[PDB]
Short mmCIF file of N, CA and C and ligand atoms in Angstrom, two decimals:
data_model
loop_
_atom_site.label_atom_id
_atom_site.label_comp_id
_atom_site.label_asym_id
_atom_site.label_seq_id
_atom_site.Cartn_x
_atom_site.Cartn_y
_atom_site.Cartn_z
N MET A 217 2.17 -13.22 10.90
CA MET A 217 1.80 -12.28 9.88
C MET A 217 2.98 -11.35 9.61
N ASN A 218 3.05 -10.80 8.43
CA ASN A 218 4.08 -9.86 8.12
C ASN A 218 3.53 -9.01 6.99
N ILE A 219 4.33 -8.04 6.56
CA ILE A 219 3.97 -7.06 5.56
C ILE A 219 3.53 -7.73 4.22
N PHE A 220 4.22 -8.75 3.79
CA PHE A 220 3.88 -9.40 2.55
C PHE A 220 2.56 -10.09 2.63
N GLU A 221 2.38 -10.84 3.71
CA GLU A 221 1.11 -11.58 3.87
C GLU A 221 -0.02 -10.61 3.98
N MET A 222 0.25 -9.57 4.74
CA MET A 222 -0.69 -8.50 4.93
C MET A 222 -1.08 -7.87 3.58
N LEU A 223 -0.06 -7.39 2.84
CA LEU A 223 -0.46 -6.78 1.57
C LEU A 223 -0.95 -7.83 0.59
N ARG A 224 -0.45 -9.04 0.67
CA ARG A 224 -1.03 -9.98 -0.33
C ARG A 224 -2.52 -10.15 -0.04
N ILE A 225 -2.95 -9.97 1.24
CA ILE A 225 -4.37 -10.10 1.56
C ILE A 225 -5.13 -8.91 0.99
N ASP A 226 -4.58 -7.69 1.14
CA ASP A 226 -5.26 -6.48 0.66
C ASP A 226 -5.29 -6.27 -0.86
N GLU A 227 -4.29 -6.75 -1.56
CA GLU A 227 -4.27 -6.49 -2.98
C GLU A 227 -4.65 -7.66 -3.86
N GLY A 228 -4.64 -8.84 -3.27
CA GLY A 228 -4.85 -10.03 -4.09
C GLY A 228 -3.67 -10.35 -5.02
N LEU A 229 -3.87 -11.38 -5.86
CA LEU A 229 -2.85 -11.72 -6.82
C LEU A 229 -3.46 -11.97 -8.18
N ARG A 230 -3.00 -11.32 -9.23
CA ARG A 230 -3.55 -11.55 -10.55
C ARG A 230 -2.45 -11.58 -11.56
N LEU A 231 -2.48 -12.61 -12.37
CA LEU A 231 -1.50 -12.92 -13.40
C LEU A 231 -1.73 -12.27 -14.76
N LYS A 232 -2.89 -11.61 -14.92
CA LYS A 232 -3.29 -10.93 -16.18
C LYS A 232 -3.55 -9.46 -15.94
N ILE A 233 -3.15 -8.58 -16.90
CA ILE A 233 -3.40 -7.17 -16.70
C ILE A 233 -4.82 -6.96 -16.20
N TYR A 234 -4.95 -6.12 -15.20
CA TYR A 234 -6.27 -5.84 -14.72
C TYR A 234 -6.45 -4.35 -14.39
N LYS A 235 -7.73 -3.86 -14.21
CA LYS A 235 -7.95 -2.48 -13.81
C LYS A 235 -8.17 -2.46 -12.27
N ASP A 236 -7.52 -1.54 -11.57
CA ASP A 236 -7.67 -1.56 -10.12
C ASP A 236 -8.95 -0.87 -9.74
N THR A 237 -9.04 -0.57 -8.48
CA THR A 237 -10.25 0.06 -8.07
C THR A 237 -10.45 1.45 -8.61
N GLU A 238 -9.36 2.12 -9.07
CA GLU A 238 -9.47 3.47 -9.68
C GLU A 238 -9.57 3.45 -11.20
N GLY A 239 -9.60 2.21 -11.75
CA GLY A 239 -9.70 1.94 -13.17
C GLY A 239 -8.35 1.97 -13.87
N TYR A 240 -7.26 1.72 -13.16
CA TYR A 240 -5.95 1.73 -13.77
C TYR A 240 -5.38 0.38 -13.96
N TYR A 241 -4.62 0.27 -15.04
CA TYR A 241 -3.91 -0.96 -15.38
C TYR A 241 -2.91 -1.41 -14.31
N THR A 242 -3.17 -2.59 -13.86
CA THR A 242 -2.36 -3.16 -12.83
C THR A 242 -2.13 -4.62 -13.13
N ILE A 243 -1.17 -5.22 -12.40
CA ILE A 243 -0.89 -6.62 -12.49
C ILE A 243 -0.27 -7.20 -11.23
N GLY A 244 -0.29 -8.52 -11.15
CA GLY A 244 0.38 -9.19 -10.02
C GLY A 244 -0.29 -8.90 -8.68
N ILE A 245 0.53 -8.42 -7.75
CA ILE A 245 0.12 -8.05 -6.41
C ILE A 245 0.09 -6.54 -6.25
N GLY A 246 -0.95 -5.95 -6.83
CA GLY A 246 -1.13 -4.53 -6.75
C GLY A 246 -0.03 -3.76 -7.48
N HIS A 247 0.59 -4.32 -8.51
CA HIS A 247 1.63 -3.53 -9.20
C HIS A 247 1.03 -2.59 -10.27
N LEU A 248 1.09 -1.28 -10.01
CA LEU A 248 0.50 -0.35 -10.97
C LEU A 248 1.34 -0.27 -12.23
N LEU A 249 0.73 -0.37 -13.36
CA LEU A 249 1.60 -0.27 -14.54
C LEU A 249 1.58 1.13 -15.13
N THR A 250 0.35 1.66 -15.27
CA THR A 250 0.20 2.99 -15.85
C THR A 250 -1.15 3.53 -15.57
N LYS A 251 -1.20 4.89 -15.58
CA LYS A 251 -2.41 5.68 -15.39
C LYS A 251 -3.19 5.89 -16.68
N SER A 252 -2.46 5.79 -17.76
CA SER A 252 -3.02 5.94 -19.09
C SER A 252 -4.05 4.87 -19.28
N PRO A 253 -5.10 5.21 -20.05
CA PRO A 253 -6.20 4.32 -20.36
C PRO A 253 -5.94 3.49 -21.61
N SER A 254 -4.69 3.55 -22.12
CA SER A 254 -4.28 2.78 -23.29
C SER A 254 -3.67 1.47 -22.84
N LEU A 255 -4.29 0.39 -23.29
CA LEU A 255 -3.86 -0.93 -22.92
C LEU A 255 -2.47 -1.23 -23.40
N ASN A 256 -2.21 -0.60 -24.51
CA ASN A 256 -0.93 -0.82 -25.11
C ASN A 256 0.18 -0.15 -24.35
N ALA A 257 -0.11 1.01 -23.79
CA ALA A 257 0.88 1.62 -22.94
C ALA A 257 1.13 0.66 -21.76
N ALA A 258 0.04 0.06 -21.31
CA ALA A 258 0.14 -0.88 -20.21
C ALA A 258 1.02 -2.12 -20.53
N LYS A 259 0.80 -2.71 -21.69
CA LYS A 259 1.57 -3.87 -22.05
C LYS A 259 3.02 -3.50 -22.25
N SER A 260 3.26 -2.31 -22.79
CA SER A 260 4.64 -1.83 -22.97
C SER A 260 5.40 -1.75 -21.63
N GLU A 261 4.70 -1.13 -20.72
CA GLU A 261 5.12 -0.98 -19.35
C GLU A 261 5.43 -2.34 -18.70
N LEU A 262 4.46 -3.30 -18.85
CA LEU A 262 4.62 -4.67 -18.35
C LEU A 262 5.91 -5.28 -18.90
N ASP A 263 6.08 -5.17 -20.24
CA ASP A 263 7.27 -5.70 -20.91
C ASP A 263 8.54 -5.14 -20.38
N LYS A 264 8.52 -3.81 -20.24
CA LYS A 264 9.68 -3.11 -19.66
C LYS A 264 10.01 -3.55 -18.21
N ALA A 265 8.98 -3.70 -17.40
CA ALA A 265 9.18 -4.13 -16.05
C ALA A 265 9.67 -5.58 -15.91
N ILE A 266 9.22 -6.52 -16.73
CA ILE A 266 9.62 -7.93 -16.58
C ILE A 266 10.91 -8.27 -17.31
N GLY A 267 11.08 -7.59 -18.43
CA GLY A 267 12.28 -7.85 -19.23
C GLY A 267 11.96 -8.84 -20.34
N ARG A 268 10.77 -8.76 -20.85
CA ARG A 268 10.38 -9.68 -21.87
C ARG A 268 9.01 -9.33 -22.34
N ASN A 269 8.70 -9.88 -23.50
CA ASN A 269 7.39 -9.62 -24.10
C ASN A 269 6.39 -10.60 -23.44
N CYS A 270 5.48 -10.04 -22.69
CA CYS A 270 4.56 -10.83 -21.89
C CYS A 270 3.21 -11.02 -22.55
N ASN A 271 2.91 -10.06 -23.39
CA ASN A 271 1.62 -10.05 -23.96
C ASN A 271 0.57 -10.02 -22.82
N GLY A 272 0.78 -9.19 -21.79
CA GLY A 272 -0.22 -9.05 -20.73
C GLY A 272 -0.31 -10.15 -19.67
N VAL A 273 0.57 -11.13 -19.70
CA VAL A 273 0.47 -12.20 -18.69
C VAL A 273 1.82 -12.51 -18.06
N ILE A 274 1.82 -12.88 -16.80
CA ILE A 274 3.08 -13.11 -16.15
C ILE A 274 2.89 -14.33 -15.33
N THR A 275 4.04 -14.85 -14.87
CA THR A 275 4.08 -15.97 -13.95
C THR A 275 3.99 -15.46 -12.51
N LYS A 276 3.82 -16.40 -11.59
CA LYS A 276 3.67 -16.12 -10.17
C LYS A 276 4.98 -15.59 -9.62
N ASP A 277 6.03 -16.24 -10.13
CA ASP A 277 7.37 -15.91 -9.77
C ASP A 277 7.66 -14.46 -10.15
N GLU A 278 7.24 -14.14 -11.37
CA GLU A 278 7.36 -12.80 -11.88
C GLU A 278 6.56 -11.84 -10.97
N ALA A 279 5.35 -12.20 -10.55
CA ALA A 279 4.57 -11.31 -9.71
C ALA A 279 5.19 -11.11 -8.37
N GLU A 280 5.73 -12.21 -7.88
CA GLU A 280 6.37 -12.11 -6.63
C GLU A 280 7.61 -11.31 -6.69
N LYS A 281 8.22 -11.39 -7.85
CA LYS A 281 9.40 -10.60 -7.98
C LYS A 281 9.08 -9.10 -7.93
N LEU A 282 8.05 -8.71 -8.70
CA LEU A 282 7.62 -7.29 -8.68
C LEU A 282 7.25 -6.81 -7.28
N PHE A 283 6.57 -7.73 -6.58
CA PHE A 283 6.13 -7.50 -5.21
C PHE A 283 7.29 -7.22 -4.26
N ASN A 284 8.34 -8.03 -4.36
CA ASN A 284 9.51 -7.77 -3.52
C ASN A 284 10.06 -6.37 -3.77
N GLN A 285 10.18 -6.06 -5.05
CA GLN A 285 10.70 -4.77 -5.35
C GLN A 285 9.84 -3.66 -4.85
N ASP A 286 8.58 -3.87 -5.01
CA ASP A 286 7.65 -2.86 -4.63
C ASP A 286 7.61 -2.59 -3.13
N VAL A 287 7.75 -3.66 -2.32
CA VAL A 287 7.71 -3.45 -0.89
C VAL A 287 8.94 -2.63 -0.52
N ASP A 288 10.01 -3.08 -1.12
CA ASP A 288 11.24 -2.47 -0.88
C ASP A 288 11.21 -1.00 -1.22
N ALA A 289 10.71 -0.73 -2.42
CA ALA A 289 10.59 0.68 -2.85
C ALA A 289 9.76 1.52 -1.86
N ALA A 290 8.67 0.94 -1.36
CA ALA A 290 7.83 1.68 -0.42
C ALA A 290 8.58 2.08 0.86
N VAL A 291 9.26 1.08 1.43
CA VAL A 291 9.93 1.34 2.67
C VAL A 291 10.99 2.41 2.47
N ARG A 292 11.71 2.15 1.41
CA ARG A 292 12.76 3.05 1.13
C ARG A 292 12.16 4.43 0.90
N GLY A 293 10.99 4.50 0.28
CA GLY A 293 10.41 5.82 0.10
C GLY A 293 10.14 6.52 1.46
N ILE A 294 9.66 5.70 2.39
CA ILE A 294 9.37 6.20 3.70
C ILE A 294 10.60 6.81 4.32
N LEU A 295 11.62 5.97 4.37
CA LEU A 295 12.80 6.41 5.02
C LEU A 295 13.39 7.58 4.33
N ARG A 296 13.05 7.81 3.09
CA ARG A 296 13.67 8.97 2.48
C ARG A 296 12.85 10.24 2.66
N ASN A 297 11.66 10.09 3.20
CA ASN A 297 10.80 11.23 3.39
C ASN A 297 10.97 11.93 4.77
N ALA A 298 11.39 13.21 4.74
CA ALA A 298 11.60 13.96 5.99
C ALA A 298 10.33 14.10 6.84
N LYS A 299 9.20 14.12 6.20
CA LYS A 299 8.03 14.20 6.99
C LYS A 299 7.62 12.83 7.50
N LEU A 300 7.88 11.81 6.71
CA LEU A 300 7.50 10.47 7.06
C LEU A 300 8.45 9.72 8.06
N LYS A 301 9.73 9.80 7.79
CA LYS A 301 10.76 9.08 8.53
C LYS A 301 10.62 9.06 10.03
N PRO A 302 10.42 10.24 10.56
CA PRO A 302 10.30 10.43 11.98
C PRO A 302 9.07 9.73 12.60
N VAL A 303 7.99 9.77 11.88
CA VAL A 303 6.82 9.11 12.38
C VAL A 303 7.05 7.60 12.35
N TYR A 304 7.41 7.14 11.19
CA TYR A 304 7.61 5.75 11.03
C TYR A 304 8.55 5.19 12.06
N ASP A 305 9.63 5.90 12.32
CA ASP A 305 10.55 5.35 13.32
C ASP A 305 10.01 5.43 14.71
N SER A 306 8.96 6.28 14.95
CA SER A 306 8.47 6.36 16.29
C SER A 306 7.59 5.18 16.59
N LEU A 307 7.23 4.46 15.55
CA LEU A 307 6.26 3.36 15.74
C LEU A 307 6.82 1.97 16.01
N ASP A 308 5.97 1.10 16.55
CA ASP A 308 6.31 -0.28 16.80
C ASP A 308 6.11 -1.02 15.49
N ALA A 309 6.56 -2.24 15.50
CA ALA A 309 6.55 -3.08 14.32
C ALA A 309 5.21 -3.33 13.61
N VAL A 310 4.15 -3.58 14.36
CA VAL A 310 2.95 -3.87 13.64
C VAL A 310 2.53 -2.60 12.98
N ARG A 311 2.53 -1.59 13.84
CA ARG A 311 2.09 -0.31 13.33
C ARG A 311 2.88 0.13 12.08
N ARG A 312 4.16 -0.24 12.09
CA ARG A 312 4.97 0.12 10.96
C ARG A 312 4.40 -0.58 9.73
N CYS A 313 3.85 -1.76 9.89
CA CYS A 313 3.32 -2.42 8.69
C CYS A 313 2.15 -1.68 8.12
N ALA A 314 1.38 -1.15 9.05
CA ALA A 314 0.26 -0.36 8.62
C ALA A 314 0.73 0.83 7.75
N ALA A 315 1.85 1.47 8.10
CA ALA A 315 2.35 2.64 7.36
C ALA A 315 2.82 2.30 5.95
N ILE A 316 3.46 1.12 5.81
CA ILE A 316 3.90 0.61 4.55
C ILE A 316 2.72 0.36 3.61
N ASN A 317 1.66 -0.26 4.15
CA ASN A 317 0.45 -0.58 3.40
C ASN A 317 -0.13 0.64 2.75
N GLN A 318 -0.27 1.69 3.54
CA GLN A 318 -0.81 2.96 3.04
C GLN A 318 0.03 3.52 1.91
N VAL A 319 1.35 3.48 2.16
CA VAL A 319 2.31 3.98 1.20
C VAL A 319 2.29 3.11 -0.05
N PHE A 320 2.16 1.79 0.14
CA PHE A 320 2.10 0.90 -1.02
C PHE A 320 0.86 1.23 -1.81
N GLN A 321 -0.24 1.43 -1.09
CA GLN A 321 -1.48 1.72 -1.79
C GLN A 321 -1.56 3.09 -2.41
N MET A 322 -1.09 4.09 -1.69
CA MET A 322 -1.28 5.43 -2.20
C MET A 322 -0.07 6.27 -2.55
N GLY A 323 1.14 5.80 -2.37
CA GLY A 323 2.26 6.69 -2.69
C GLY A 323 2.55 7.61 -1.49
N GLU A 324 3.83 8.01 -1.48
CA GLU A 324 4.49 8.81 -0.45
C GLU A 324 3.89 10.20 -0.40
N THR A 325 3.36 10.49 -1.54
CA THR A 325 2.64 11.70 -1.83
C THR A 325 1.32 11.71 -1.04
N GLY A 326 0.43 10.77 -1.41
CA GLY A 326 -0.86 10.60 -0.78
C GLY A 326 -0.69 10.60 0.72
N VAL A 327 0.30 9.86 1.21
CA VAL A 327 0.53 9.82 2.64
C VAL A 327 1.08 11.07 3.29
N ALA A 328 1.90 11.82 2.56
CA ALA A 328 2.45 13.03 3.14
C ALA A 328 1.38 14.10 3.54
N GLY A 329 0.22 14.16 2.86
CA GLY A 329 -0.84 15.13 3.21
C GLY A 329 -1.77 14.73 4.39
N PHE A 330 -1.38 13.67 5.05
CA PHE A 330 -2.10 13.19 6.20
C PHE A 330 -1.46 13.76 7.48
N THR A 331 -1.04 15.01 7.31
CA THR A 331 -0.41 15.79 8.32
C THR A 331 -0.91 15.64 9.70
N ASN A 332 -2.21 15.91 9.82
CA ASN A 332 -2.82 15.82 11.14
C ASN A 332 -2.75 14.43 11.76
N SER A 333 -3.00 13.46 10.91
CA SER A 333 -2.98 12.06 11.37
C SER A 333 -1.59 11.71 11.75
N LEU A 334 -0.68 12.23 10.92
CA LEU A 334 0.70 11.92 11.16
C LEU A 334 1.09 12.36 12.50
N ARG A 335 0.75 13.59 12.71
CA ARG A 335 1.09 14.13 14.01
C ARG A 335 0.47 13.29 15.12
N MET A 336 -0.82 12.94 14.96
CA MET A 336 -1.42 12.20 16.07
C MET A 336 -0.77 10.88 16.24
N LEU A 337 -0.42 10.24 15.10
CA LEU A 337 0.23 8.94 15.24
C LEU A 337 1.55 9.11 16.05
N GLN A 338 2.27 10.19 15.78
CA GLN A 338 3.52 10.38 16.43
C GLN A 338 3.36 10.53 17.97
N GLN A 339 2.24 11.10 18.31
CA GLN A 339 2.01 11.32 19.71
C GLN A 339 1.41 10.18 20.39
N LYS A 340 1.16 9.12 19.63
CA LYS A 340 0.55 7.90 20.20
C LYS A 340 -0.89 8.07 20.66
N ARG A 341 -1.57 9.00 20.00
CA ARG A 341 -2.99 9.27 20.22
C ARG A 341 -3.80 8.38 19.24
N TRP A 342 -3.79 7.07 19.53
CA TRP A 342 -4.37 5.99 18.70
C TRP A 342 -5.79 6.20 18.27
N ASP A 343 -6.69 6.33 19.22
CA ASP A 343 -8.05 6.47 18.78
C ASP A 343 -8.25 7.77 18.03
N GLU A 344 -7.50 8.77 18.42
CA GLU A 344 -7.69 10.02 17.80
C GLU A 344 -7.27 9.95 16.41
N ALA A 345 -6.15 9.35 16.25
CA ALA A 345 -5.64 9.23 14.88
C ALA A 345 -6.61 8.42 13.95
N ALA A 346 -7.21 7.37 14.56
CA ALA A 346 -8.06 6.46 13.84
C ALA A 346 -9.31 7.14 13.27
N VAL A 347 -9.86 8.06 14.03
CA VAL A 347 -10.99 8.86 13.61
C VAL A 347 -10.60 9.79 12.43
N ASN A 348 -9.53 10.52 12.63
CA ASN A 348 -8.97 11.40 11.61
C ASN A 348 -8.73 10.67 10.30
N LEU A 349 -8.11 9.53 10.49
CA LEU A 349 -7.82 8.73 9.31
C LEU A 349 -9.06 8.45 8.46
N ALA A 350 -10.16 8.27 9.13
CA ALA A 350 -11.41 7.88 8.47
C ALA A 350 -12.00 9.02 7.74
N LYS A 351 -11.61 10.22 8.14
CA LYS A 351 -12.14 11.34 7.40
C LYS A 351 -11.34 11.59 6.12
N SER A 352 -11.55 10.72 5.13
CA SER A 352 -10.71 10.89 3.97
C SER A 352 -11.30 10.22 2.78
N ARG A 353 -10.85 10.66 1.61
CA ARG A 353 -11.35 10.02 0.41
C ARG A 353 -10.98 8.54 0.44
N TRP A 354 -9.72 8.28 0.86
CA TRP A 354 -9.20 6.90 0.98
C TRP A 354 -10.18 5.98 1.73
N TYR A 355 -10.58 6.44 2.92
CA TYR A 355 -11.50 5.58 3.66
C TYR A 355 -12.81 5.36 2.91
N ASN A 356 -13.33 6.47 2.38
CA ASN A 356 -14.56 6.42 1.63
C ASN A 356 -14.50 5.65 0.33
N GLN A 357 -13.37 5.64 -0.41
CA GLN A 357 -13.40 4.83 -1.61
C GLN A 357 -13.14 3.33 -1.34
N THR A 358 -12.26 3.04 -0.42
CA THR A 358 -11.94 1.63 -0.14
C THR A 358 -12.07 1.39 1.32
N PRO A 359 -13.30 1.45 1.73
CA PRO A 359 -13.60 1.27 3.14
C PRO A 359 -13.18 -0.07 3.83
N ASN A 360 -13.41 -1.21 3.19
CA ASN A 360 -13.06 -2.44 3.89
C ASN A 360 -11.58 -2.48 4.21
N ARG A 361 -10.79 -2.13 3.19
CA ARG A 361 -9.36 -2.11 3.34
C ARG A 361 -8.89 -1.04 4.36
N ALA A 362 -9.37 0.20 4.16
CA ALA A 362 -8.99 1.30 5.07
C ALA A 362 -9.28 0.87 6.50
N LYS A 363 -10.42 0.16 6.64
CA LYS A 363 -10.82 -0.30 7.97
C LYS A 363 -9.77 -1.16 8.62
N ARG A 364 -9.23 -2.07 7.82
CA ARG A 364 -8.20 -2.98 8.32
C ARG A 364 -6.94 -2.26 8.75
N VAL A 365 -6.53 -1.35 7.89
CA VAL A 365 -5.31 -0.61 8.18
C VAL A 365 -5.47 0.26 9.41
N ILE A 366 -6.67 0.93 9.47
CA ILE A 366 -6.92 1.83 10.61
C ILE A 366 -6.92 1.09 11.92
N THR A 367 -7.50 -0.10 11.85
CA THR A 367 -7.53 -0.88 13.07
C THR A 367 -6.17 -1.27 13.46
N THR A 368 -5.39 -1.43 12.43
CA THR A 368 -4.05 -1.85 12.67
C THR A 368 -3.34 -0.69 13.37
N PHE A 369 -3.53 0.51 12.87
CA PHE A 369 -2.90 1.66 13.57
C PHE A 369 -3.40 1.85 15.03
N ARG A 370 -4.71 1.70 15.15
CA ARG A 370 -5.34 1.91 16.41
C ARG A 370 -4.91 0.97 17.50
N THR A 371 -4.76 -0.29 17.13
CA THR A 371 -4.46 -1.28 18.17
C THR A 371 -3.08 -1.78 18.24
N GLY A 372 -2.31 -1.67 17.19
CA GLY A 372 -1.03 -2.30 17.20
C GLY A 372 -1.11 -3.87 17.20
N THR A 373 -2.18 -4.52 16.73
CA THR A 373 -2.19 -5.99 16.74
C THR A 373 -2.60 -6.41 15.35
N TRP A 374 -2.61 -7.70 15.05
CA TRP A 374 -3.05 -8.13 13.74
C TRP A 374 -4.53 -8.55 13.70
N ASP A 375 -5.32 -8.19 14.67
CA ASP A 375 -6.70 -8.66 14.64
C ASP A 375 -7.54 -8.47 13.42
N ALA A 376 -7.34 -7.37 12.68
CA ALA A 376 -8.14 -7.04 11.52
C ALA A 376 -7.82 -8.02 10.42
N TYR A 377 -6.69 -8.64 10.58
CA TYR A 377 -6.35 -9.51 9.55
C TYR A 377 -6.51 -10.91 10.02
N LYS A 378 -7.17 -11.06 11.19
CA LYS A 378 -7.50 -12.32 11.86
C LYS A 378 -6.31 -13.24 12.04
C1 LYL B 491 -1.11 8.24 7.76
C2 LYL B 491 0.22 8.08 7.68
C3 LYL B 491 0.89 6.98 8.47
C4 LYL B 491 2.37 6.93 8.16
C5 LYL B 491 3.31 7.18 9.16
C6 LYL B 491 4.68 7.07 8.87
C7 LYL B 491 5.08 6.74 7.58
C8 LYL B 491 4.14 6.47 6.59
C9 LYL B 491 4.71 6.11 5.24
C10 LYL B 491 2.77 6.57 6.88
O1 LYL B 491 1.75 6.34 5.98
CL1 CL B 492 10.98 -4.20 -12.65
CL1 CL B 493 -12.02 -1.84 0.33
#
């Protein structure tokens, strides 16, 4: 298992513009296009991102391409965050995947306000952190997924992803 397989499991793959769980225009492997509720803004965005007029549809290769960039962007976001960097580096590899997933799903922003959890993760207080983590809108809106990630933090193994 690795970060890509992991996130490809959590986000799925779709070749046509779609609305995510928050009702936003997305495509491929969880690639957010825009927050605006205008489809046309979305297609514009899609066009800009691929480098061609897609008319709302892309190839697998194209999705995978966006995906590579996106993973990359997430990690790099982590490492550039003073609050995040230190935690992330304190962790082992599996656990690090869990951190990327959260960041991929919610942004460096969303993750930065998980102060308390962050701290607990840094201290290696696994179960403690796992409980804290659950007390959140994130867990409550996307429970199956949050569950997987949390377990991942808690145990350091890939069991949640079987
Ligand atoms: C709940 C936060 C866990 C966490 C620790 C380190 C770095 C990132 C990006 C992260 O999401
Ligand atoms: Cl792009
Ligand atoms: Cl879910």
